[PDB]
Subunit: 292 residues, 5 copies
């Protein structure tokens, strides 16, 4: 059976002439094909004001090393070892479109290496990644966030992202967003290889949200009613003033929470702007009638 | 008696052929059984809006090293030494479901090693760990937060979490949450070993909270009274308007503080939505009667 | 006179067989007695909502090393040297009850060593330390915050906190809190040595605070006056509504700022809750009289 | 074809007598001309209250090394290698006018070196850079933000910024700001070389913004109307009070969001101050007429 | 002319027997006189609530090394070299009264050394430094902030701060604060040398501020007018209630923004407290007259 001394001998011979900074290819003219595996774990939040999405992923990177190989029968059937991540060449993949707010560094850890040269380098990653969030169809709104991977400095004739396999682990259920992160895409070659996973996010219709909407609907009905009220009823000016006040309160409230960076504005927000304008027109009619 | 030179000799012989990256087993076919001890210290806060719980734990890790052994009679009865945490193999346990906001790194410290090979590696850990917080039964609400431990990259045929012993140290009393973190659970094997401690949190009924509720109750009584008030009393429209205003003020207030990510909405919030709807219906009746 | 070469020779002989990880005692059966000196510098703030106190201290640690000694007459009267903090054994003292938000690491610096073995290791430390803040007697409120020191992993038969000498440096005057941090306490032995300094904090009565109170007092007088107002005066309902509004505005305001984690609620807050209830009862009487 | 052993030999000979701290020039009397390439990627936000702009750039640095050269025919046509960034001399360029909030250190990475000595050192950089933000012509406002580069400590007779080439990558479209970052500028020599890229930012006129203004315009019309209303209409005092309230609500609202550090105040804010003053004058006229 | 090999030889001989931790003096009885140069660059903000001032300085430190000298004619006229900051002894100067929020560590960089032994160690530093901010004379308020330098652990017989030369670089104009940071001061010897630069800050009177004041003045005039209004006018109670509401709105607003830690409270705040008290007295008179 394999022993501690056997693995020690294997590692000692394995790392004899290894340069961490020289790409791991016998012939330097060939590229190293990296296939990345980005399994989402949890979608913590979707910050509308800052245009970010906070999530934790299980970024995986797989490639082939041609210098790190061995006949396992020559080492008592040792088929795999674990190496410190900072002793071996690692492709310079970065979360190109993201602020990596991770708590561990990307050079402290361990990777799994197989006797054929295949390296697995699973790594956890908490990302604050930029998304262009359009709150147009709120609250029945959808969004598309692209999580980018790209090599840092290597050219496509040196290192390439062969493929990007993105899935969802289903660790937790959200109850606020319906996440749809599935599919395979080849890397895009434009001087530096890079790929992106499209994340589709649909807000789930919660009865808390529908209840929060209900006040808006009944205020619209009430505004219509007071606008239809007889000019000589006597309550015109009073209810027009009080409900213009309340309308402006909700307009300020929503406007301070709606994203300011959208391709189009929020339909609901504009519908409440129209409501406030109609309340103002009702007040105008009331004062005009009162003076005349 | 044991001396400084004796411990120096012991350490020098002990670390002679030790590889930090080779698992500590004579035969590599055997697994290293890690038993984790997670004693809670303080529950700083339960952030509802961010769906996190902030606490400080005394994470402990115990396993057995088969290479680090000695006959203590051969070294003047030295029964235990202290080694720097980064010189010895350490299982790659991570707070899988947590943002480790600790201030010290997880590779700077010290561990206690016993002559039989048993290693104790107590470590402090301040965690911002994700919890699905349902504010349904507020303020008589309960919650279940699972604190996850899982090996980072090792397979179950290499490293396993034998057990998880979680308790509460009682360092401090909360006065806001009743914490119930006690029990033992075996590790779960699904390609990577992992376990979780269930933390049950019950909000303690404080008289500050009951006093905060009292205004809501008296506003409900007052709304019922004004709704029952005679249409021809003369105060109908006035009190309906003013109390619809105040109702909406409390509705906005609570809605901006209630969690938006819940399996069900807050019953109290929906009860105040119903109160606001009834106030609106009272205003509708008042205006209808006033015009007719 | 002592020279650079003399100190170089001294250090070279001093560090010859020193192991940073072996406790500094000739006989390992004896404990190392550490006396800690915690001089407060400034009390930046007392955050009520987060239950923390922010301050900057001059944590000092003194112990005796039995391996690091020399006859000063043998080295041209060199009586003390300065060593890098990470080359020498340092007791593993941690701010057990604190989030060390310091900006320098605890392994980068310098310590003063004397020819008798005595080590001084003064270190600055900015702490966010947990305190159970009870806002009961606000604004004439007092608090007790205990700053904890405890060894990280060493047993009481290896390392002990001999004493804790805590004082105040008086660097700055607060004008908001009266600080009383003075006294000496022996360490407490419960498997791991530890001690704590009690910090008493009394809010200083400022005329800004008394002025902030004045509105509350005059609102109480005014509420009493309107409650005593004749039912048939005609201003009853109007002033009851407007002053219930303003009362609720201040009640919401204070409740959003008062700590939610207190042994008892704030007396002033409950007195304003009673004020709001009395305003509601006045409104109830007014509407009842108006209908009848 | 070039091989791993060939590149190993090349690097071994290349780094034989290289001192990272000695400037890379054969004759020390000559300067190293550094040309910097600052390609903007995304303009995350423009924080008005803090006077900062948050963006992510692709800072590039190019210079010539006279010690790191080779005849590529002597090494099987190896024309370029990749070196770790901390093994080679790197010009001490700093984001002089910026808080570098990047997540990777500036001494961990890789650079591209060519057989003629030319070094490319592309590096990602997320910057919180100070800008003097004048909200005068809001919301048709423009701004000029200068991104500064300057050598840290080297004199102009040692290191110089030859040129600064700044462009925009167009990675993402903003929809909130029109960015115009293009042009070439020579470095400025004043004891320490330095250059700056001028960034012009024009707020794009969105229909969400125009809708947000619409309430202000109709309130101005309504204030004019009520000011023109007959003194004896009977609604003067009522609408003057209610609309002074609402005016002050919007004045407080805008004033709490407008930058306090501007060369001139916001015209729109001052126009609404004038609106509030006119409402106050209307109230003055109403009360004066009512008493007389 | 000097060459790369010449500088390599110089550095190799220079660092032969240099100990980074032994003070750089031939005779250890002499002190090292450090003169510090603190040139301010920008005053980002003055945070009133947290009692801090955020600025970026060009902290410089100059002293004399007696071991690092050379005859420049013996090395082809090399008159100065650049050494890595962590290879040479560096005085342990700390921003004693500040939270150093800098992004680079204080042991990564470079210093300029001259053939006579003189070392220049210019370093950038972004500081969050504590200031006792008294908002008494707001908005015509002044402040004095002292930026402290002190040696960390060395005694005055080992290391001293000879002088502190503080100036302003004028990099940017503030438009909000008039900064006056100029002068020279000797170090203060009280067991540990230390000095401080006094920074005087005067708020510049902006027309945005005067316009923001204008509402307060017109509300004072209006309150005087309504208080003078005839008891039997009929608008007394109405305007007293509405303007007590608005007064309390501004009182709450200012009180939540004024610093709570001041030697004396804000005069303007207390003048508005008096305004609110006068409004309350007017309401008291109105209700008393109405009942009687
Ligand atoms: C490693 O390289 C050295 C040259 O530096 C050579 O002598 C040795 O034979 C090589 N060994 C292997 C296993 O490639
Ligand atoms: C490198 O190129 C040569 C050229 O013939 C080829 O024989 C060799 O197989 C290549 N290396 C590998 C690992 O295939
Ligand atoms: C080596 O180990 C593998 C692991 O499954 C096993 O299938 C194989 O039979 C083993 N071979 C020998 C020669 O031990
Ligand atoms: C790879 O591409 C880069 C730029 O695209 C070029 O400079 C380099 O010479 C190329 N290398 C090879 C081996 O083709
Ligand atoms: C996810 O999106 C893709 C592309 O829009 C679609 O084909 C697929 O059906 C979606 N899946 C779910 C579960 O929504
Ligand atoms: C992606 O790459 C594979 C491998 O060369 C190729 O077969 C396939 O056609 C490419 N395109 C897609 C859409 O998979
Ligand atoms: C340690 O390993 C070496 C081989 O590198 C061997 O010569 C030596 O005897 C070993 N010593 C022990 C104590 O195992
Ligand atoms: C390793 O396996 C062999 C196989 O017989 C066994 O004799 C030996 O005891 C095992 N090692 C240990 C430490 O038990
Ligand atoms: C060794 O130390 C242990 C510690 O309790 C003690 O019980 C034992 O008697 C000692 N044995 C010898 C031989 O000193
Ligand atoms: C352990 O499991 C992994 C995957 O489950 C497998 O690749 C590996 O060969 C296994 N090793 C042994 C010794 O069974
Ligand atoms: C804690 O929870 C468990 C399981 O729900 C229960 O058996 C136990 O009684 C609880 N203990 C306390 C103190 O609530
Ligand atoms: C847990 O593991 C132990 C040890 O093998 C076993 O005896 C026990 O049955 C397992 N299950 C539980 C619930 O303890
Ligand atoms: C230090 O220890 C070594 C053994 O490693 C010994 O040969 C030497 O004499 C010791 N020197 C001193 C000064 O203790
Ligand atoms: C250690 O113990 C022995 C036992 O007699 C004693 O003589 C010696 O003095 C002790 N060491 C010290 C430093 O006192
Ligand atoms: C050694 O230095 C101390 C320092 O005060 C002094 O008192 C003493 O006389 C000196 N002794 C000699 C022999 O120099
Ligand atoms: C010290 O105490 C620990 C636990 O309290 C024990 O394991 C250890 O054996 C003790 N050592 C001595 C020398 O008494
Ligand atoms: C500090 O508190 C202690 C204990 O409560 C008391 O004896 C002492 O007089 C206090 N000192 C001051 C200055 O308040
Ligand atoms: C503290 O320790 C000292 C030293 O042994 C002892 O004299 C004293 O009685 C202890 N207790 C107190 C309260 O000081
Ligand atoms: C490098 O410098 C050494 C002197 O330290 C010299 O002997 C050697 O020849 C030099 N080699 C090269 C390639 O410059
Ligand atoms: C350095 O100066 C000498 C002086 O003549 C000159 O010949 C030489 O070419 C210079 N070095 C380089 C790299 O040009
Ligand atoms: C070296 O490589 C370059 C790369 O394009 C090629 O153009 C040139 O012909 C090659 N020369 C030799 C001799 O291989
Ligand atoms: C370069 O300039 C600095 C200051 O401007 C001066 O001290 C130094 O002597 C100059 N060096 C040369 C080689 O001119
Ligand atoms: C950018 O600004 C420059 C200088 O103001 C101007 O010449 C150029 O036309 C501008 N370009 C765009 C696209 O606005
Ligand atoms: C900038 O530097 C270049 C290179 O010396 C020079 O030709 C040019 O005149 C300078 N000025 C401008 C505006 O480009
Ligand atoms: C440096 O110190 C060593 C002793 O460690 C001595 O032999 C050598 O001569 C010294 N060299 C210089 C230049 O001082
Ligand atoms: C050190 O002191 C001696 C005492 O006479 C003196 O001669 C010498 O000059 C001093 N060192 C220096 C660098 O002045
Ligand atoms: C050395 O360089 C300085 C730099 O200005 C110059 O003034 C001096 O003449 C030079 N001397 C020699 C001998 O080269
Ligand atoms: C320097 O002062 C410290 C304390 O002030 C003292 O302990 C030390 O002995 C003094 N050293 C000399 C050389 O005077
Ligand atoms: C700065 O303050 C000092 C001392 O108060 C004063 O002498 C000097 O005139 C002031 N300068 C300015 C520009 O305010
Ligand atoms: C400061 O130190 C210098 C140098 O000794 C001295 O001349 C001066 O009198 C001291 N005081 C002042 C105010 O400069
Ligand atoms: C490194 C990696 C990627 C890039 C780069 C440098 N410069 C760019 C300019 N435009 C687009 C991408 C890049
Ligand atoms: C390492 C450790 C755990 C995991 C991993 C990589 N990839 C996963 C995918 N799904 C679930 C868990 C994991
Ligand atoms: C190290 C240091 C202190 C402790 C520890 C581990 N475990 C504990 C459990 N309960 C209380 C204190 C501790
Ligand atoms: C280093 C680099 C730049 C500077 C410096 C030190 N001191 C300065 C004083 N004023 C302006 C720039 C500088
Ligand atoms: C180091 C540096 C400065 C100080 C110190 C330790 N202890 C103090 C106590 N009081 C004041 C200053 C200090």
């Amino acid at each position: 059976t394999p022993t501690y001394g056997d693995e020690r001998l294997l590692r000692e011979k394995l790392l004899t002439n290894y340069s961490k900074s020289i790409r791991p290819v016998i012939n330097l003219t060939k590229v190293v094909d990296v296939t990345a595996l980005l399994y989402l774990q949890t979608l913590y939040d979707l910050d509308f004001v800052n245009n970010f999405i906070m999530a934790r992923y299980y970024l995986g990177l797989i490639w082939i090393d041609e210098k790190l190989t061995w006949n396992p029968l020559d080492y008592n059937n040792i088929t795999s070892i674990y190496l410190p991540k900072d002793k071996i060449w690692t492709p310079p993949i970065k979360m190109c479109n993201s602020m990596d707010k991770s708590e561990e560094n990307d050079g402290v850890g361990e990777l799994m290496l197989t006797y054929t040269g295949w390296i697995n380098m699973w790594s956890f990653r908490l990302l604050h990644t930029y998304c262009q969030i359009n709150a147009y169809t709120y609250p029945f709104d959808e969004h598309t966030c692209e999580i980018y991977l790209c090599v840092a400095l290597h050219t496509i004739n040196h290192t390439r992202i062969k493929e990007l396999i993105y899935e969802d682990s289903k660790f937790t259920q959200n109850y606020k967003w319906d996440i749809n992160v599935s599919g395979k895409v080849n890397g895009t070659d434009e001087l530096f290889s890079y790929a992106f996973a499209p994340m589709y996010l649909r807000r789930k219709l919660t009865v808390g949200i529908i209840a929060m909407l209900i006040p808006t609907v009944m205020m619209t009905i009430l505004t219509i009613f007071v606008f239809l009220l007889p000019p000589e009823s006597g309550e015109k000016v009073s209810l027009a003033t009080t409900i213009f006040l309340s309308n402006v309160l909700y307009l300020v409230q929503i406007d301070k929470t709606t994203p300011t960076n959208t391709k189009y504005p929020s339909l609901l927000m504009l519908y409440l702007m129209l409501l406030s304008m109609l309340s103002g027109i009702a007040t105008l009619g009331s004062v005009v009638i009162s003076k005349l």
